[PDB]
Ligand binder design. Structure first.
Ligand SMILES: Nc1ncnc2c1ncn2[C@@H]1O[C@H](COP(=O)(O)OP(=O)(O)O)[C@@H](O)[C@H]1O
Length: 204
């Protein structure tokens, strides 16, 4: 159930998965392929928990995790994507975004920070940004975490999912009620995408 718990075997599985993640990093580094991981969800959904578990055994030299907050005034002097462009990883490196550019079609939309034209146009803008990256030597995965203006958020999220879920930049939905499930799920999904990419290129 969502009201389920798993244990002890969890701990063993986590370690294995975490080590598999280390191996992934080694691959990414060697083949100079960047990884951008996006975590979006409502507060208390377990984003940060998942992030911690994902990179526990990864070398800190290899990754940077970015907490994303509302744009400050100096950020508003440029286009909305610029902040993210500055925080992009170099090839071989991992960038994790706690919240992200998807803010445009989520919070900004709900709280009226973005005009309707602005947020309506954004899905395609975002898709085009991600494609510029994915066409080259970046991998992107996006994670949404749900725990049982909340209705308005679900509506916004769905449209996000419809318009911006793409093969090269998938949206993965994770049930967060059991934190352990979620942490395992995030690791499993991250690893699989990387393996499929390794297959797409002739690697490992
Ligand atoms: N572009 C953005 N505009 C405003 N807030 C943003 C933006 N990107 C991220 N945020 C974060 O979202 C917070 C607003 O609450 P939010 O998480 O969107 O809703 P909820 O609490 O209902 O899940 C801000 O305090 C900030 O941490």
């Amino acid at each position: 159930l969502s009201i389920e718990l798993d244990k002890k075997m969890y701990k063993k599985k986590l370690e294995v998965l975490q080590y598999e993640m280390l191996n992934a990093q080694q691959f990414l580094l060697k083949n100079k392929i960047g990884l951008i991981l996006v975590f979006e969800g409502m507060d208390a959904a377990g984003k940060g928990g998942a992030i911690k578990r994902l990179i526990e055994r990864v070398d800190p030299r290899g990754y940077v995790v970015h907490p994303i907050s509302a744009p400050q005034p100096h950020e508003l002097r440029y286009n909305y994507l610029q902040r993210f462009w500055r925080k992009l990883p170099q090839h071989g490196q991992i960038a994790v975004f706690d919240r992200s550019w998807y803010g445009r079609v989520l919070v900004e939309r709900i709280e009226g920070f973005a005009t309707k034209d602005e947020w309506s146009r954004a899905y395609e803008e975002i898709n085009n940004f991600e494609k510029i990256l994915t066409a080259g030597d970046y991998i992107i995965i996006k994670f949404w975490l749900h725990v049982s203006k909340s209705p308005q958020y679900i509506e916004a999220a769905n449209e996000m999912f419809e318009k911006t879920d793409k093969k090269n930049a998938p949206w993965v939905l994770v049930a967060g009620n059991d934190k352990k499930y979620a942490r395992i799920q995030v690791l499993q999904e991250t690893l699989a995408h990387i393996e499929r990419e390794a297959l797409k290129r002739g690697l490992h």
